Amino acid sequence: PSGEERCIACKLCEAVCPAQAITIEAEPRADGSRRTTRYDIDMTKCIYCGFCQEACPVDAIVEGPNFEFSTETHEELLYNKEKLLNNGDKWEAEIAANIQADYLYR
Amino acid sequence: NLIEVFVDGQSVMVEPGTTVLQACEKVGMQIPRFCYHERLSVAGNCRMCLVEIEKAPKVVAACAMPVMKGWNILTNSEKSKKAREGVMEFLLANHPLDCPICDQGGECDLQDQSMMFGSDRSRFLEGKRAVEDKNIGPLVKTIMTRCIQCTRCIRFASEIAGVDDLGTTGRGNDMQVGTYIEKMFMSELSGNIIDICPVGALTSKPYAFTARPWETRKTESIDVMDAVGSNIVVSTRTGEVMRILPRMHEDINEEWISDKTR
Amino acid sequence: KLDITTLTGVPEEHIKTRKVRIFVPARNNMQSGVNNTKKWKMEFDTRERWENPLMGWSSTADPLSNLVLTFSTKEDAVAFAEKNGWSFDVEERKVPKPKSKSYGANFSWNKRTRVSTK
Amino acid sequence: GALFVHRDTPENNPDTPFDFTPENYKRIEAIVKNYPEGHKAAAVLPVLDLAQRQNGWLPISAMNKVAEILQVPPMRVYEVATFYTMYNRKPVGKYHIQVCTTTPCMLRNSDSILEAIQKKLGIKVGETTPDKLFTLIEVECLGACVNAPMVQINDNYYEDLTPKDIEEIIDELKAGKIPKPGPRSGRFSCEPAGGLTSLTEPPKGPGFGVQAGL
Amino acid sequence: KKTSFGSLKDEDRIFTNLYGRHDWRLKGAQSRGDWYKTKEILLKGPDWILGEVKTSGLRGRGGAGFPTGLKWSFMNKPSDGRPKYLVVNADEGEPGTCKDREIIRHDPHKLVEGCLVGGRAMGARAAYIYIRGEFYNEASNLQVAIREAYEAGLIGKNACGSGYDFDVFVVRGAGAYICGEETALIESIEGKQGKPRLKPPFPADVGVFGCPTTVANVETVAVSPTICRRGGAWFASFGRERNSGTKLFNISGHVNHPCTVEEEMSVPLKELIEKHAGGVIGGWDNLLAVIPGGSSTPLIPKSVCETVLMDFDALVQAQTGLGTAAVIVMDRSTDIVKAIARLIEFYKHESCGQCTPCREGVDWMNKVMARFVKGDARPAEIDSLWEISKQIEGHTICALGDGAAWPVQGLIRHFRPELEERMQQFALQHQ
Amino acid sequence: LQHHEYSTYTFLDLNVELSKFRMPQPSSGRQSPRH
Amino acid sequence: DAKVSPPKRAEMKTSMESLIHHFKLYTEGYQVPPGATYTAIEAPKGEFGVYL
Ligand SMILES: Cc1cc2nc3c(=O)[nH]c(=O)nc-3n(C[C@H](O)[C@H](O)[C@H](O)COP(=O)(O)O)c2cc1C
Ligand code: SF4
Ligand code: SF4
Ligand code: SF4
Ligand code: SF4
Numbered sequence A: 001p002s003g004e005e006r007c008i009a010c011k012l013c014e015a016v017c018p019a020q021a022i023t024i025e026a027e028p029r030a031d032g033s034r035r036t037t038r039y040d041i042d043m044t045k046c047i048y049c050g051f052c053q054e055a056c057p058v059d060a061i062v063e064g065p066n067f068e069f070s071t072e073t074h075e076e077l078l079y080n081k082e083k084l085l086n087n088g089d090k091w092e093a094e095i096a097a098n099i100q101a102d103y104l105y106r
Numbered sequence B: 001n002l003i004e005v006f007v008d009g010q011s012v013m014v015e016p017g018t019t020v021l022q023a024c025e026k027v028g029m030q031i032p033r034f035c036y037h038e039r040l041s042v043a044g045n046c047r048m049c050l051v052e053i054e055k056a057p058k059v060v061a062a063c064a065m066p067v068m069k070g071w072n073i074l075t076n077s078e079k080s081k082k083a084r085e086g087v088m089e090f091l092l093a094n095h096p097l098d099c100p101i102c103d104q105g106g107e108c109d110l111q112d113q114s115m116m117f118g119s120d121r122s123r124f125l126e127g128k129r130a131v132e133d134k135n136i137g138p139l140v141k142t143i144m145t146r147c148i149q150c151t152r153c154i155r156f157a158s159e160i161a162g163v164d165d166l167g168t169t170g171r172g173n174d175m176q177v178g179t180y181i182e183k184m185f186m187s188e189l190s191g192n193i194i195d196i197c198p199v200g201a202l203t204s205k206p207y208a209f210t211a212r213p214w215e216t217r218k219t220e221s222i223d224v225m226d227a228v229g230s231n232i233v234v235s236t237r238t239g240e241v242m243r244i245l246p247r248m249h250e251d252i253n254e255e256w257i258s259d260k261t262r
Numbered sequence C: 001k002l003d004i005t006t007l008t009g010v011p012e013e014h015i016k017t018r019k020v021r022i023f024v025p026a027r028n029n030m031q032s033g034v035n036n037t038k039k040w041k042m043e044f045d046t047r048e049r050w051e052n053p054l055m056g057w058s059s060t061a062d063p064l065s066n067l068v069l070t071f072s073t074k075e076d077a078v079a080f081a082e083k084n085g086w087s088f089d090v091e092e093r094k095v096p097k098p099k100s101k102s103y104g105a106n107f108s109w110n111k112r113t114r115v116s117t118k
Numbered sequence D: 001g002a003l004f005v006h007r008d009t010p011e012n013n014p015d016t017p018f019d020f021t022p023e024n025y026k027r028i029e030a031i032v033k034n035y036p037e038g039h040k041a042a043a044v045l046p047v048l049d050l051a052q053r054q055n056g057w058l059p060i061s062a063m064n065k066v067a068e069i070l071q072v073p074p075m076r077v078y079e080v081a082t083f084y085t086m087y088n089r090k091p092v093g094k095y096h097i098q099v100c101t102t103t104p105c106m107l108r109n110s111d112s113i114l115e116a117i118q119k120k121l122g123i124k125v126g127e128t129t130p131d132k133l134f135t136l137i138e139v140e141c142l143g144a145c146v147n148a149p150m151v152q153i154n155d156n157y158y159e160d161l162t163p164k165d166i167e168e169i170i171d172e173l174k175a176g177k178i179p180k181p182g183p184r185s186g187r188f189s190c191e192p193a194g195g196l197t198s199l200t201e202p203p204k205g206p207g208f209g210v211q212a213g214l
Numbered sequence E: 001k002k003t004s005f006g007s008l009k010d011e012d013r014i015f016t017n018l019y020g021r022h023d024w025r026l027k028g029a030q031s032r033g034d035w036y037k038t039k040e041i042l043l044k045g046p047d048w049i050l051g052e053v054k055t056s057g058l059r060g061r062g063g064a065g066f067p068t069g070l071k072w073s074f075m076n077k078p079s080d081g082r083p084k085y086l087v088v089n090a091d092e093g094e095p096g097t098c099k100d101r102e103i104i105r106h107d108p109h110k111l112v113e114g115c116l117v118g119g120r121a122m123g124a125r126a127a128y129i130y131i132r133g134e135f136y137n138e139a140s141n142l143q144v145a146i147r148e149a150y151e152a153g154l155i156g157k158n159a160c161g162s163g164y165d166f167d168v169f170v171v172r173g174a175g176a177y178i179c180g181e182e183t184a185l186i187e188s189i190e191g192k193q194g195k196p197r198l199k200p201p202f203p204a205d206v207g208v209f210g211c212p213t214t215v216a217n218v219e220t221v222a223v224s225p226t227i228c229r230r231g232g233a234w235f236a237s238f239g240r241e242r243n244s245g246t247k248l249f250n251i252s253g254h255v256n257h258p259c260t261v262e263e264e265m266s267v268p269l270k271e272l273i274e275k276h277a278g279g280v281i282g283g284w285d286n287l288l289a290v291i292p293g294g295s296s297t298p299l300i301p302k303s304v305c306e307t308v309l310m311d312f313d314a315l316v317q318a319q320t321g322l323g324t325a326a327v328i329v330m331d332r333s334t335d336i337v338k339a340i341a342r343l344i345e346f347y348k349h350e351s352c353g354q355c356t357p358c359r360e361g362v363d364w365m366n367k368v369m370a371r372f373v374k375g376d377a378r379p380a381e382i383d384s385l386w387e388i389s390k391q392i393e394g395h396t397i398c399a400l401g402d403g404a405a406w407p408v409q410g411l412i413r414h415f416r417p418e419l420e421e422r423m424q425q426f427a428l429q430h431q
Numbered sequence F: 001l002q003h004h005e006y007s008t009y010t011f012l013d014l015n016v017e018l019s020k021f022r023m024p025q026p027s028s029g030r031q032s033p034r035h
Numbered sequence G: 001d002a003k004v005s006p007p008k009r010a011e012m013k014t015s016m017e018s019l020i021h022h023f024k025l026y027t028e029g030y031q032v033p034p035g036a037t038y039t040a041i042e043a044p045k046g047e048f049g050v051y052l
């Protein structure tokens, strides 16, 4: 809620990825916090298993409600940390409500 | 004058003065340890080395107990497993939930020994302790809340480095490891404390947050900074050198490397 | 004199130009466990890795970059390397030498082993 | 509540002036002679106690001076100072009131004495009076559990205390009068209060019931 | 052959000057029979002294109660060129124990002569008496007694004209209960933090300054001269078999006349409380959970106290221990949970910290016990506390852990209903 | 009753006085273990 | 059993043992005792088997 990114560069979500679709690099940021310099999910190697949503400890990475994100080029589907954060900002209102709905089942 | 002792019913001939842990090592059993390092002196504080000797009411610390002829070391008895579970529970009672952010994660003796010799749940329903972090230099990043008071760093600094600047201050659960003053631990072999520390309390500042253990590819090589020829493991991920870790060569470098090499 | 090189299907460049290292992996000094130091491993020589222009991901052209094989004994790994016609280098196993440990020595009357702090 | 890390301050910096007085140096020589040669590090506790007695508290400079005198690493002196409670690592009041609040003393309404001390001094436990003459701290078994309640001062045991007794002792200390150590009730020692139930008869004397073969 | 012990005449009392009414200086000690024919005892030989101790059947007064004669004989082996030392443990840190304070303050020459005799038995050049730092005045008294002995020639070169060179040194502690433990005492004397060693190297083979050392309680050492002069069989006469001797007892707590008294071993607890302690406050009906042998020993309910005999084995049968012989009495107008919690907090503050079991579990038990005293816990927590105590006990490097575990186990075992009642009451209060 | 009047340095002064009566101390053979 | 099945999210976020087990299970996984098995079920299309 502060606006700080939830990711703490655990890379365990990268580790559990069945298709190795997540590439993560991290360095201590100017504040000294453990943040990701690089977070990439290849939406073309992803199997949309739902892992790393269960695996990620801080709830940072979430498969949101959107399904209509078709692209006219292959490169558009190789997401970047900026693109993923923009998606999180775009869909946070729905994502938070869905997590609230299902957080007790998890 | 080898004497005969039995580890889980198997006869092993060991020289007098051999500890129970080394006798188990002879048969391949690696007694779980947190505070015992072969290079360093024996301490016995950790208490994870406790094992049951047949016909003996009290479990013994494998690290610090010399074997006696005819002893049968029951390394997997119910008593030994329960002692390991209790010691692990005590170790994890006040340990911070920093694993996702702890650099030692994936290479932490506490994690693996909990997954192998400990319970899968916590009965601790109270608040955990916190320790103010100490600054000991520009190379070792210190998060002392993760410390398990194994005293490995103190014994290393005293015995190998020769710098008697790290010690324990206070008593009880408030006991803390680190220079009482704002002293900086400076030595050629200071970086080895990062390796020796079982938990991620002491970690490499330059390597902090850069990578996780499973990702790295390990290449065995030799250092060139000095003519000692220390054997090293060069850890690379995605074609980029991530860290230099010591490799054991008893003849040249036991398990240590200089700060310049590291 | 067994040779399966023709039958393997490996291209000639990797058969001839690659050096395979037969070794017992050293213990990760970060951990005291020794379970990962009990079996011989065969690993191929490292080759070029470059950054992908689009994303910066590490790209490789070495088919055997990630190929690692486990062998119970050194002789078996050597036999496999010879049968597959790979040049092999064997590093002898490194075993921790036996040490003498005494808790009493920490409190010696006359020796230097006495410990200032416990 | 005392911290076990040292933050350098103008009062407690390493350059704070402390050196043993020459008589204390002779006492240090006497202390060192007690322990075997080559183990002069054993003098650390008595020498630190001497330093605390001389200065009233142990500054970091005092610990460094002890380490230098005994040729021991300073960190060991730091460890000894932190581990043992009696050593004072911060300045304390002229008279240190230590109230034993352990189970045996607790059963003998020690909290009453503690509260009376708090009210008279005006300071809560762990605080020093603005006059800097009294510091109140609770402690564990001081060894006179049988003569509870019992509050120790700089070095004297004022045992078998009642609220009025403790208030009177505090008044005497404020006046500068030195109270006599011992049970402030009628009893003189661990003797049964009403009367001696043992040792009523005179001592038997030398040579009593001595084994013939000796 | 007597089936009921509990009455000791003044003649048989070793500590004649226990209450201090007679002079504590050398003149008084000599007048009361101290330092009598000590030369003859020393000349008789180490073996005769150890045999006298063994025949006495004396058990260690520290609280462990190991056979004193066998313990001292461990040091009888020929010297290897290292010096030998005898360390008298005057720490007296156990909550409720005050005997050693009386012994040192009012009868120091007893301890000095006992040190000489024991050192002769152990072949020890010198004896170090570790005295609790808080006991400053008693330490000064002991130093004065030692000075008088040195002037008289009783100690020092040619001690008592026996051709035996012995020195008594008094070392004062810095305020730590753990230092009472023998290895912790040795470490503290050596100048390190007072943290117990691992036993596998035993104190006899390696001790203070890395030399053979025997650590004995002040009472055990003090009784040695009287045991030698009067004879071992004299000590054996008092008390049951294996529990022989006259033991100092500290009766404290909710008793009309708190006092320290000397009575034969095996004296009935009710007899000791009523005869010398003035009876329980409110009478015997009000008795609730007397602590038999100090804080470390588990509490016993009133029913057990009615017929219990104060000897080592009998108290062990009671699931308690004689310990330091300190009797702490609680009247029914007491919160047993609060008292046991205070003792557990004492253990938390007095823990060294090196042993993970003790360092963490004792703090854990203290927090759980505070929650219990408030009542802010579920009933299941009691079994969890029992299991935690069992984990702590027998796995620590020092008995302090077991000392912490035992009171919690005793409280659970004998007053479990009270804790559940308080938990239910708290739940009702907060609804 | 003598204990009623003891000063801060009484114990150390008594030790200083007793120094003369004390016998020669044993030596490990080295100035310090660190030596 | 938290050494085979991951702990619940609240437990992982509140308990140290649960966090350790979650970390290891989602990074290393659970070691399976050495062995081999052919397990078959009556799948809708017939017998489905895994020789693991
Ligand atoms: C935590 C703890 C505190 C102890 N405190 C004392 C003590 O204050 N005085 C004492 O004589 N023994 C104390 N002991 C017992 C000693 O470790 C040891 O058993 C004793 O000195 C042996 O004396 P003995 O030979 O007369 O039995 C303590 C033990 C423990 C575990
Ligand atoms: S939860 Fe997501 S953002 Fe956080 S460390 Fe794991 S992969 Fe990175
Ligand atoms: S949901 Fe996507 S990012 Fe997560 S593990 Fe599956 S493929 Fe990888
Ligand atoms: S910092 Fe690490 S090595 Fe040092 S005592 Fe703590 S856990 Fe042991
Ligand atoms: S070192 Fe401590 S914080 Fe880091 S993974 Fe291990 S137990 Fe967790």
Ligand code: SF4
Binding pocket: E178, E195, E196, E350, E351, E352, E353, E354, E355, E356, E358, E359, E396, E397, E398, E399, E400, E401
């Ligand atoms: S049991 Fe407690 S007091 Fe004894 S050594 Fe261990 S931590 Fe220290």
Ligand code: FES
Binding pocket: B033, B034, B035, B036, B043, B044, B045, B046, B047, B048, B049, B050, B061, B062, B063, B064
């Ligand atoms: S290191 Fe574990 S008991 Fe010694």
